[PDB]
């Protein structure tokens, strides 16, 4: 049902995100933190993206510079619930603004 859906989604996000940002270089440095259901994407500046998760239905969080918002699914692309933003793109703007160079998720 839900827990399984949540978990498989979680697995693919967690993996692909961590992998992507461990892979890509930059201006700044990058150390990804992996904790128990938590990712924390940390630059040499000391600033960071906070990723952690809420309900085992479909609900995940993400926090950054401007604060952030929770992460909800539209279709092939997660939005931020806020007004209805975007996964990879807003995450780009977040990471980019804290790191100091285009952090390329797409």
UniProtKB/Swiss-Prot annotation:
CDD domains: Frataxin
UniProt keyword annotation of Nucleotide-binding present: no
Keyword Transmembrane: no
Keywords: Iron, Metal-binding
Highest taxon, organism lineage: Bacteria
Impact after mutating residue 18 to K: Abolishes iron binding and increases kinetics of Fe-S formation on IscU
GO BP annotations, alphabetical order: iron-sulfur cluster assembly
GO molecular function terms listed in the Swiss-Prot or TrEMBL record: ferric iron binding; ferrous iron binding
One matching Pfam family: Frataxin_Cyay
Disrupted gene: phenotype observed: Cells are not affected in cellular iron content and sensitivity to oxidants.
Gene Ontology cellular component annotations, sorted alphabetically: cytoplasm; cytosol
Regulation: Binds iron under oxidative stress conditions, but not under conditions emulating the intracellular redox potential.
Membership in a protein family: Belongs to the frataxin family.
Cited function: Involved in iron-sulfur (Fe-S) cluster assembly. May act as a regulator of Fe-S biogenesis. Can bind both Fe(2+) and Fe(3+) ions. In vivo, has a positive effect on Fe-S cluster biogenesis under iron-rich growth conditions. In vitro, can inhibit IscS cysteine desulfurase activity and the formation of Fe-S clusters on IscU. In vitro, in the presence of IscS and cysteine, Fe(3+)-CyaY can be used as an iron donor during Fe-S cluster assembly on the scaffold protein IscU.
Quaternary structure annotation from Swiss-Prot or TrEMBL: Monomer. Forms homodimers and higher oligomers in the presence of iron. Interacts with IscS.
Protein name: Iron-sulfur cluster assembly protein CyaY
Native source species: Escherichia coli (strain K12)
């Amino acid at each position: 049902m839900n827990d399984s859906e949540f978990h498989r989604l979680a697995d693919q996000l967690w993996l692909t995100i961590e992998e992507r940002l461990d892979d890509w270089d930059g201006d700044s440095d990058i150390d990804c933190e992996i904790n128990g259901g938590v990712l924390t994407i940390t630059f040499e500046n000391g600033s960071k993206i906070i990723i952690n998760r809420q309900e085992p239905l479909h609900q995940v969080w993400l926090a950054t510079k401007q604060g952030g918002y929770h992460f909800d699914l539209k279709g092939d692309e997660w939005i931020c619930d806020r007004s209805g933003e975007t996964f990879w793109d807003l995450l780009e703007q977040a990471a980019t603004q804290q790191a100091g160079e285009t952090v390329s998720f797409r």
